Amino acid sequence: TFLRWAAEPEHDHRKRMGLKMLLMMGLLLPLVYAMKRHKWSVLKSRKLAYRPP
């Protein structure tokens, strides 16, 4: 246990950032994914037709 601290003293502080990340990334990913399918929504819903003379 001591040596794992020696070779990786950042261990105990590593994960706390690992925790902060997944909570933020748990939020930003869907929200950004909404703005995407908000702006692209025009195109996923558009329609077309062909009215020659």
Added chain:
Amino acid sequence: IEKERDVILQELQENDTSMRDVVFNYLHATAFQGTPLAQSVEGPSENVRKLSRADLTEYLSRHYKAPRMVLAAAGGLEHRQLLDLAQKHFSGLSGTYDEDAVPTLSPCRFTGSQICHREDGLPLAHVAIAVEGPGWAHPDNVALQVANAIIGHYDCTYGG
């Protein structure tokens, strides 16, 4: 009825070239989707072909009622002269109607949308953008007529 049927189909072909009228008709189609206001005054060529005398007598016997109508004039006459003729002639109108013969107008659903009729063969590009308006009676119509007037209007013939 059958003559003017052919005439009006000839008019639509002419109005197919009046690019200005097309845009507003496309415009109302999109602002006011799913409502009557999306319709044109002239309506589709189909109904023009698929119409009857009966459809009209229904339309006339329903809508043309004295309460919804107005006589009015202006110029070198007098009000009192107009009444003596209204009673003489217009006293015979159907001033009444059944319990639910006359419809009423609900508000219509504006919506935000775009219509892009691509035709590169034609040399110029008509455009029309707009939003939802107040209505007739809403008082802020006055202020907006100014705001439009600030922007004004232009053709390539104005010498300013």
